[PDB]
Write a protein that binds this ligand. Structure first.
Ligand SMILES: [Mn+2]
Ligand SMILES: [Mn+2]
Ligand SMILES: [Mn+2]
Ligand SMILES: [Mn+2]
Ligand SMILES: [Mn+2]
Ligand SMILES: [Mn+2]
Ligand SMILES: [Mn+2]
Ligand SMILES: [Mn+2]
Ligand SMILES: [Mn+2]
Ligand SMILES: [Mn+2]
Lengths: 377, 377, 377, 377, 377
């Protein structure tokens, strides 16, 4: 029907023209919990509310600090490639982390010692490209759609250093001298960037591997996240990839969280840095507790970016009928959380009772084992 | 049906879970014009995507620089009051401008010479409260819903100076000494703010007027915008209120624009300052031209805030079947625009022809008269 | 005796080594009102806690943004001159306002049209020197001690442009060419600044007046504040000097407030800008109400600087046996305040009653006339 | 010969590879006056050290805050147009001031009321375009070369809003609707900016004047600076144009200074704001006195930009055999200076003598009349 | 008697109302050394000049960047707890370092792997809590008073994340789901923070230790500083705790310095970072040498905070009859100093003589061994 911002004897009907569809998506913002209080920055933004760059071969859209100003340290691109299409050879100042949501793709990277890494990535796999190292993406026969995260919030995918753009803005006589060729031999170079372009599907990965005099890279730039054993608890699963297991991923730590219907990512905080979120599928709500009696609740669904500033308390509750699947992203060399339950469970029971004005019936339910996703009883 | 980010041979279908409802609201963002280019800051935000503060008597929600970071100089509150309900006597550093969308309300203000102004405001009326002067709002028998604009983007309606909050945080012995009463006589003062509270409807305006030894205020703090004669053109109407006619409104200039179906606010820019927008009803698109070959198109509908940074070129096209009604707001002492049509019409025809590579058939259609809203032929 | 931070059943004795003398000066900070709450910036600093620059002829010490960081827009110097001593001819970017606390002095200024103003200033008189105009101070037979206020908080009196410093760092051949003299004729110029130096007392003011071809300055740079009629109320007096009466004083508005024992500067705020304070004599306390349930109380006595950020609510209570005398300083072209009493007195009584949960016995005591200083009954 | 950084018994020969040509241009920087002292920001930059944008029809190069970081508030473009060539119709946020050094040009401007101003400007003439008003430049039969000054140091001439760029990034269907034409009628619009382009010479000015329903502009946007009577003194001339005589020029004040060989712009400072300089012809040196015993000397010649921060003491000495001609530019509504000579001349002689440790033989030479340019005797 | 700002033939008596008690505390500021010079930021602030938050169970007051703006990286709280009273379970972004001045207390901490550390701390002991890890303090039978230092100058103790505040602003249904309990079972949860609250004394430490499945923490969070062997020299003792011995203390390095009457902390500087100081007992003066001929002397006594910006030269002299005891605090992973004496002692004697214009009689007294506290002879 028609939701209204009314909670008991508080609030009133909306009397002006309104966005009913967005109101239906945001039930806990039109009607917040009575426990919310105070001014809190916006922690929510939809990729559907961004300009989509369309090219022959795919598209790209981004959520940056210009869209979500609380997220100064992290930005993200949703990129889509048709079968065989190429994201042009390029580099940038920022490190790049990726999660393959749909399909598969071949990536290349060459490091500062001239060593080559070429690999195929499928659904649930990651890559991480350190700052400044040059790379490319080419979708395979299913096409590909993936999430990129960059470790500077001011990033824009329109501002990468692309191979053909660099050459188009270098004097032809300098290019000729650089490679030992004539200007006539390079006369057919593109006059502008390609960025994303259609291409025939590549051959088998084994036939693309390039050998060289500098040997193999010491650590791989891809990771099979969903092939790892997750942390399993009553209501879902958590798969963690940070620099302790995905060795090259020095500036991005990540977790993929799945939350069954009727379950929730438990009350917790992160003692190391801010959390950046992407909602892959499902529907959620989250209250961010900001200290000094401040708290604000946000709604999220597929396509949304979320955020939790450093050490703010939070939970992520599935409020729908399907599994809730989201990413937790951190600009750090490791994942870390503190569980509210485990914290209190590891303290003397009478000390917790003195804080909460509750009795042994409550402290008896605390668990010294951390369960990141719990199920409603 | 199901829209897709495809434009001719560019783009592709979405393969990941997505927000179809938001995509349907943003057709020119999922599929932008081919004439868009480059990185442009976000210029669009919905009140439906904000936390609504619910109280006994109404609600308030806000769009600030924490939601829309391009808008550093202006912020806005959507406030609703039930019949008789009071927005508590308060003040703040920012000047406040208001447009009454629904219903009616009584306002009070007292200036720094102790002069009182009390007045009723109905649909289409404005008020403007200069910085720091204390005021209140009380809805009449229909209730009220209105848009507030404050001339600092960092404002928050949770941070005003309220009468009862001030008194609750002043020593009782100081309050007693201030007014010449005993502490017992003030023992029933509230212990916390009221902010918005239910109240019986007031009596007639004439019975509320307070006379005093300092006389009448020199200029009124309310304005009947829709009682003025608008600028009428083929496709709509523009009603302007700035410091040249609404004399007290020194830091906010405003225009209410109505655009018939099949019409558009013409191509123009503002030579004085940034534009802040509120979409009262209807559906629009706008391309913002940002210089250096950069342009980005945005979709808007009822409940949305928009923005155009200082001097960027723009138009506002009605893309729906109902009238499009929106506000243009400026932090300045006057409204000013330059019309692309009128500009070229006031130049030698051969000079315009040399720029545009078009002939007399085009310069013949230019108009030396400014028509802010034009109708498609 | 020995004060302790105990208020009823709250607080405890101090168990570590402590500053009992400062604790005795700050009773409302060691034991704040129970109505204080929350984090508020420091609003209090003593000239006695600053380095005093001693010279032959006097001294100078300063309180700047480096001492009191809330005061970004205003800084102050306490300067003392012995009889006849000269503060060297100099200029600076900042405008300068002054209050003569003790003694008397002769000032000079020359404007950008070459017009000269020379005048004597006594106790209770002011001067104001616009930005960049060059000036000097010479104490008369009693010596002089005065307060200077500069309209930039980053000012330092060690960084003025002094006549002899400029000449000492200009090539001698350029000085010679500038004035049409030989290098030998200027060989005795000082090699360094003088800043403050001893000198014989000057003659009568009438004998110093310099006539010139450009005529008299249009407005005087001195003002006899204490010769004006003050605003008198039950508990004290207020003398205001701003650009409406002290015409040249365009960027500094000022009030000298005297508060009898048992009286208080009433509850009020300023709707235009921040307040900077200097306590000339006596003892006070002030609570600053900072919005959102925040308030903090400060103690002041002779030699202290205070501050009230833009629009924060405040009062200034005399807590001693002698008159309390202080300055209110504003970076603006006029003085403005709103009185809490007068505000409520100019509203319908039942409307005030609905806010305060008090009856006609309270609204009957409100006054439509502003009384800046009230006396306890 | 070969200059060396040696001054008496100080300094030494240069032993590393060096730039002898630049050293010869900077004698007072390789060998500064012994009266210089301390760290002072760079105040000097050459247009010859900038990238020149070459187009069919002319060129443009710029000195901005990215070249000269002390100049945050002002930037400049040196622009050249061949006979008949057009600087494309455009606008920008910044106000624009211009001095015609060589040749002549026709300018157009249309204001926010649709009023047209078209005029020819010759050598020694100025124009001023207020913020955001659209304009164009077309050189006449001699071509034109001129200096532009913009009142924001972050300006870049590559970032203006150009007519054809705006249209190229606007949907064709929107352009068509805006003017009431078909998409086919506008199919020949340029696909990119023109910026500067060759064109046939225009006809007589009288034949270009466009009449309109909104009447004439109230104040002209051009000024004949060199037709005014200058301030004449022994060694040169000063022509001032600010908002008191060039009425539209509200944010830029200017003076053209000519200094004969053997003469100097006298010791002075500006009490209102920073000075920006352009050296049209000749050779100079200037010492900037920065307070606290700091001073640094700079050399300038044709093509150089200079700067003097707010209120710093300075002189400008001709150190060559030809006249020295330069511009003094200020971001303010008026020109103002204080003369060191006139300042001291308007004070009691014994008071000046007590400061300088000089006698009546020196104070006798002071002049109560201001002479901005003095001649060596 | 009555001190005056007179030094030989410089300075003068104070003629205006003044703070004699503060002047007596600041003899080297009312009458600085003649070797002081120039503008230097304030380096001194008293806890007695701060608002004291009083609660049932104790108090807390703070010195932050809002009080002492030079200290951007470090802030401090003086906290007092009555016997048995609890500082509520909480966490914050900042790391926390502590020195127990009086009494004793029990601390708890749980890390991000769920491991528990509980320990008692007495006079002269330290703790260090890494960023974001949750902790509590409970005073034992003597009560406790201690100094906290946080590694961000913008910290405020009013802004921690407290257990009961978080729960009070979390929906009850979410808390219930998180722990697997009913809303009725948690109905008695507090509605607001406790912060500090009275409580019965705890039992023996051994009975509070909580065992768990994740084992012991790898490094302890407490340190017995005064049980270590100090660096002993002629006039006092230095006890150092940094990350090389107090292993967890990664962002705070510390030294406790005791200076006998007639002794001084020698002339030295720190090559790694800024110094933050707390004066536990006694009376001192310190000159800070700031480069470029700038130096300023400050007085300190019990309860004062001091500061020395990165690498500035300094000494700390005992100017009283009792021992001087103070803390040196650094935001770094190690303590480092350079001794002026040891520096010169480790250079060729004739090279030092050429610098100082002194002979072998001076270089003969230099010591190659570092003596941090020397005694006057
Ligand atoms: Mn990339
Ligand atoms: Mn999390
Ligand atoms: Mn308001
Ligand atoms: Mn507009
Ligand atoms: Mn001065
Ligand atoms: Mn006040
Ligand atoms: Mn221009
Ligand atoms: Mn000048
Ligand atoms: Mn803590
Ligand atoms: Mn030290």
């Amino acid at each position: 029907d028609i939701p209204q911002p009314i909670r008991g004897d508080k609030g009133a009907t909306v009397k002006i023209p309104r966005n009913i569809e967005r109101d239906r998506q945001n039930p806990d913002m039109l009607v917040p919990p009575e426990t919310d209080h105070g001014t809190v920055s916006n922690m929510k933004f939809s990729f559907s509310d961004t300009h989509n760059r369309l090219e022959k071969g795919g598209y790209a859209r981004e959520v940056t600090v210009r869209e979500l100003p609380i997220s100064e340290n992290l930005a993200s691109v949703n990129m889509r490639l048709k079968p065989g299409a190429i994201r042009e050879l390029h580099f940038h100042k920022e490190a790049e982390w990726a999660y393959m949501i749909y399909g598969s793709a071949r990536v290349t990277i060459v490091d500062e010692k001239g060593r080559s890494f070429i690999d195929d990535v499928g659904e649930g796999d990651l890559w991480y490209f350190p700052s400044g190292l040059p790379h490319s993406i080419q979708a395979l026969e299913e096409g590909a759609e993936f999430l990129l995260v960059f470790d500077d919030g001011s990033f824009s995918e329109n501002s990468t250093f692309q191979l053909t753009d660099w050459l188009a803005h270098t004097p032809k006589e300098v290019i000729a001298a650089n490679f030992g060729v004539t200007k006539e031999e390079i006369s057919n170079l593109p006059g502008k960037e390609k960025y994303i372009f259609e291409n025939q599907l590549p051959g088998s990965l084994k036939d693309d591997i390039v050998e060289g005099p500098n040997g193999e890279v010491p650590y791989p730039f891809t990771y099979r996240l969903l092939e790892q054993e997750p942390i399993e608890s009553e209501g879902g699963k958590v798969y963690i990839a940070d620099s302790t297991n995905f060795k090259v991923s020095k500036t991005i730590a990540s977790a993929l969280v799945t939350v069954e219907p009727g379950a929730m990512r438990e009350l917790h905080w992160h003692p190391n840095t801010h959390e950046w979120q992407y909602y892959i599928s499902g529907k959620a709500r989250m209250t961010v507790f900001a200290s000094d009696g401040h708290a604000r609740t946000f709604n999220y669904q597929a396509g949304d970016v979320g955020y939790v500033p450093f050490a703010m308390g939070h939970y992520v509750e599935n409020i729908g009928d399907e599994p809730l699947v989201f990413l937790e992203i951190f600009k750090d060399d490791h994942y870390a959380d503190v569980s509210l339950n485990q914290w209190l469970a590891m303290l003397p029971e009478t000390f917790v009772q003195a804080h909460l004005d509750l009795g042994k019936d409550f402290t008896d339910v605390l668990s010294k084992e951390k369960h990141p996703v719990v199920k409603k009883k």
